[PDB]
Amino acid sequence: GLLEAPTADWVHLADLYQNPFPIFERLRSESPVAWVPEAGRYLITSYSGVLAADVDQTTFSANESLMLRAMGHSMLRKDDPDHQVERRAWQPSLKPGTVKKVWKQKFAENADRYLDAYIDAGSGSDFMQGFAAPFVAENLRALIGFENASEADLQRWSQTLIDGAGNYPDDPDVWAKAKQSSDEIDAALEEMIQWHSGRPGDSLLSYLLRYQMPLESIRSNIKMTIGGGLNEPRDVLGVSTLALLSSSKQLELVLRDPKLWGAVFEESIRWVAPIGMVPRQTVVDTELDGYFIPRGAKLGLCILSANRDRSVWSDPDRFDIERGSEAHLAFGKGVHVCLGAWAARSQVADVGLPALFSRLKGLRLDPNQEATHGGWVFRGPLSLPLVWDKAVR
Ligand SMILES: C=CC1=C(C)c2cc3[nH]c(cc4nc(cc5[nH]c(cc1n2)c(C)c5C=C)C(C)=C4CCC(=O)O)c(CCC(=O)O)c3C
Numbered sequence: 001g002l003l004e005a006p007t008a009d010w011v012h013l014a015d016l017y018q019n020p021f022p023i024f025e026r027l028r029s030e031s032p033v034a035w036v037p038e039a040g041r042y043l044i045t046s047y048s049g050v051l052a053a054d055v056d057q058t059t060f061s062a063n064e065s066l067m068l069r070a071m072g073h074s075m076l077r078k079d080d081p082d083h084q085v086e087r088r089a090w091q092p093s094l095k096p097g098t099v100k101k102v103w104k105q106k107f108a109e110n111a112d113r114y115l116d117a118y119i120d121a122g123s124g125s126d127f128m129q130g131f132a133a134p135f136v137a138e139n140l141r142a143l144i145g146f147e148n149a150s151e152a153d154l155q156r157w158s159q160t161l162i163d164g165a166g167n168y169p170d171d172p173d174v175w176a177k178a179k180q181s182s183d184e185i186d187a188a189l190e191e192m193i194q195w196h197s198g199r200p201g202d203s204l205l206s207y208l209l210r211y212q213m214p215l216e217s218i219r220s221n222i223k224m225t226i227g228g229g230l231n232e233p234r235d236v237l238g239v240s241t242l243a244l245l246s247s248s249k250q251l252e253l254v255l256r257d258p259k260l261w262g263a264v265f266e267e268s269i270r271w272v273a274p275i276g277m278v279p280r281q282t283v284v285d286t287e288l289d290g291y292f293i294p295r296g297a298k299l300g301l302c303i304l305s306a307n308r309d310r311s312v313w314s315d316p317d318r319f320d321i322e323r324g325s326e327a328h329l330a331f332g333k334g335v336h337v338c339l340g341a342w343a344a345r346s347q348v349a350d351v352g353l354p355a356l357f358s359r360l361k362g363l364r365l366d367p368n369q370e371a372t373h374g375g376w377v378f379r380g381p382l383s384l385p386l387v388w389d390k391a392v393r
């Protein structure tokens with residue numbers, strides 16, 4: 001019949017943070033549904049289990065938590081019907097057609113500005129802070145419609161809200177910083193709401209103010225967008241750059257056919273999912289992968305692991321754009337499927353990466369400053385020093 005989910009008390013949060021992949025290989029192999037005491041959750045680690053849970057909101061609710069105190073209650077932590085009405089108000093500025101016609105040009109302007117600043121910083125400098133983070137910050141600033149905020153504001157808001165949402169230790173300074181970001185955003189939105197009402201434009205705020213979303217939901221959804229829309233594309237820029245500078249075969253494929261930049265982006269998010277775990281809570285007794293799960297159980301859907309599942313892709317631990325990345329779960333699959341996916345892909349594959357690789361000649365990793373990495377709930381390079389011989393634009 002149904003199996004009992006084992007307790008995997010050998011799984012420690014510190015080890016998941018430092019290197020999660022060998023932990024998840026063991027879990028997929030021995031126990032794809034497992035109770036992890038330190039996490040306070042059953043971790044779901046197979047492709048099958050994550051996918052099943054993600055597509056069935058009636059059984060596996062998005063509405064459980066720390067997210068509420070950090071950010072308020074956004075559409076991400078609602079189920080339908082309330083989710084769908086908010087999501088639809090959020091769609092217009094992020095459709096693929098609007099990204100192509102309106103945003104790509106703005107991204108390309110921002111790539112020039114930030115690549116020039118990285119060039120000034122000089123060979124040897126960290127790419128993560130030196131280019132990736134301010135580029136995607138200024139892009140997000142434009143997408144949303146924040147005329148009265150700087151890219152730096154956006155970077156600080158993003159990290160502090162994320163940190164508030166994972167404040168299990170209940171650090172009081174962590175809560176104080178997320179609260180202050182929340183207040184600043186509230187103030188900034190007050191002024192931007194007046195500005196954008198009545199005023200043609202293609203920013204998220206412009207479309208939104210033309211169903212009238214209540215103010216508390218505007219604030220919560222904006223905070224969620226900031227938390228979801230900056231660190232994630234920044235991380236993909238780091239992963240993709242590292243992967244191509246680590247394999248001359250992979251980089252040659254791309255230079256021989258630059259149409260493959262899209263495939264680089266899709267393979268990066270399969271290989272290292274930027275959002276590695278998403279939470280659900282069960283509403284009824286259920287099962288995943290033949291394991292019983294009790295009503296009210298809190299689950300962590302480990303996308304990071306699902307995208308390494310050896311029954312779905314051959315040699316999944318390798319970065320390989322020819323094998324490809326068909327049906328990866330990095331943007332999810334149910335009714336919450338990433339609204340930003342087209343904006344992310346354009347920023348990174350269509351603009352940022354080609355600009356980087358065409359402007360910095362002899363681009364290479366630093367043999368004397370090895371890249372560093374961390375995270376499992378969210379994962380990417382913490383630092384990525386690059387060197388180059390000469391720089392264009
Ligand atoms: C590589 C970059 C990105 C990744 C991997 C990403 C991943 C996700 N984004 C999600 C939701 C979301 N992402 C969102 C805005 C953005 N997301 C963005 C970039 C990324 N977002 C950008 C950029 C955004 C805005 C500009 C929003 C608004 C949602 C919430 C959608 C909903 O609840 O309907 C979800 C939740 C899926 C689920 O099934 O629970 C994932 C996993």
Ligand SMILES: [Fe+3]
Pocket residue numbers: 228338339340341
């Ligand atoms: Fe997203």
